[PDB]
Every structure is written in C-alpha cells, then in structure tokens.
Design an enzyme around this catalytic site. Sequence first.
Site, PDB file in Angstrom:
ATOM      1  N   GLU A  35     -34.288 161.764  42.548  1.00  0.00           N
ATOM      2  CA  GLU A  35     -33.238 161.289  43.481  1.00  0.00           C
ATOM      3  C   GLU A  35     -32.023 162.206  43.350  1.00  0.00           C
ATOM      4  OE1 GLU A  35     -33.646 159.501  45.917  1.00  0.00           O
ATOM      5  OE2 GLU A  35     -35.255 158.031  45.517  1.00  0.00           O
ATOM      6  N   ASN A  46     -28.487 160.387  55.198  1.00  0.00           N
ATOM      7  CA  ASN A  46     -29.782 159.975  55.787  1.00  0.00           C
ATOM      8  C   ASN A  46     -29.742 160.233  57.303  1.00  0.00           C
ATOM      9  OD1 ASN A  46     -29.494 157.204  53.579  1.00  0.00           O
ATOM     10  ND2 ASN A  46     -30.747 159.016  53.163  1.00  0.00           N
ATOM     11  N   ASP A  48     -30.361 158.167  59.651  1.00  0.00           N
ATOM     12  CA  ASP A  48     -29.804 156.992  60.376  1.00  0.00           C
ATOM     13  C   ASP A  48     -28.266 156.992  60.300  1.00  0.00           C
ATOM     14  OD1 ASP A  48     -29.320 156.018  57.834  1.00  0.00           O
ATOM     15  OD2 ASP A  48     -30.585 154.271  57.994  1.00  0.00           O
ATOM     16  N   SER A  50     -26.539 156.678  57.464  1.00  0.00           N
ATOM     17  CA  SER A  50     -26.128 156.110  56.165  1.00  0.00           C
ATOM     18  C   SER A  50     -26.127 157.276  55.175  1.00  0.00           C
ATOM     19  CB  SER A  50     -27.021 154.976  55.717  1.00  0.00           C
ATOM     20  OG  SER A  50     -28.328 155.449  55.490  1.00  0.00           O
ATOM     21  N   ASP A  52     -26.698 158.217  50.819  1.00  0.00           N
ATOM     22  CA  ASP A  52     -27.215 157.811  49.493  1.00  0.00           C
ATOM     23  C   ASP A  52     -26.263 158.352  48.428  1.00  0.00           C
ATOM     24  OD1 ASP A  52     -29.471 156.596  50.693  1.00  0.00           O
ATOM     25  OD2 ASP A  52     -30.881 158.213  50.011  1.00  0.00           O
ATOM     26  N   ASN A  59     -28.219 153.452  48.937  1.00  0.00           N
ATOM     27  CA  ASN A  59     -28.018 153.649  50.387  1.00  0.00           C
ATOM     28  C   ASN A  59     -26.856 152.757  50.839  1.00  0.00           C
ATOM     29  OD1 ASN A  59     -28.481 154.107  53.158  1.00  0.00           O
ATOM     30  ND2 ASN A  59     -30.690 153.973  53.007  1.00  0.00           N
TER      31      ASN A  59
END
EC number: 3.2.1.17
Length: 129
Positions: A35, A46, A48, A50, A52, A59
Amino acid sequence: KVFGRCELAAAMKRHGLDNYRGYSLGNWVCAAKFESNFNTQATNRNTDGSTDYGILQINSRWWCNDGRTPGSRNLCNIPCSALLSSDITASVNCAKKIVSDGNGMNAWVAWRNRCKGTDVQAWIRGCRL
Ligand code: NA
C-alpha cells in the site's frame, strides 16, 4: 516517517493488530508494504476522486474527511491528514473498523492481489517481537 519492516511490525503488534479479526501480523505488514512501502506520508488519488492516506492507504470515500470527496463518509471520525502522522495510532484504529466491515482484509485490493494466500509470515521473519 518511513518505517523499517520490523519497526512497523512492533508498532502494529503493540497496537493490537496481530491476529485482529484473525489476521496474523504478517498480513498487516505485507498490506503496508504494497500500500505505502511503509511510508506514513503516502497519498494516492483514486479514479473516483477519493484519496488513499497513510501506511494502509485508507480511503476518503468512507473512512476519513479530506473536504474534497463529494458524497463521502468519515466513519473513523478523523481528518485524513491524521492518517499521515509518524504515530500510526489513528491508522491502526481506523484499520480495525475497516477490517470489521464484512470483507476482512479484501477491503485492501493490494492485500487481496499481493498478500492473500502467500507466505505472509516471511514479513515478520527476523523481527524481535
Ligand atoms: Na470522506
């Protein structure tokens, strides 16, 4: 802060992640490696819109507030910036909620694709825990 592998293993164990919801310490260290490369300051946008945040790439769509994720929730009740701290308390507390949500560690796509079913104990090999 860029954690050492064993350094992060010790911190996650102290914070009660070893065998949390049945996931051994190596699963959590492996998730953090793919990650964030163990970097608390890691941020990644991301598709969309959003973002992280932090060692476990939590998220903003569901878990933290960053003020720029329309229609999102803040279920860990924290600013997403708190997930970048050198102190992993907020990330661990929020990760416990995520992994409890019904799909276990499948919530972390990198865990599912890179850690799930592998020899995750290798990630704690050599560590004094
Ligand atoms: Na949010």
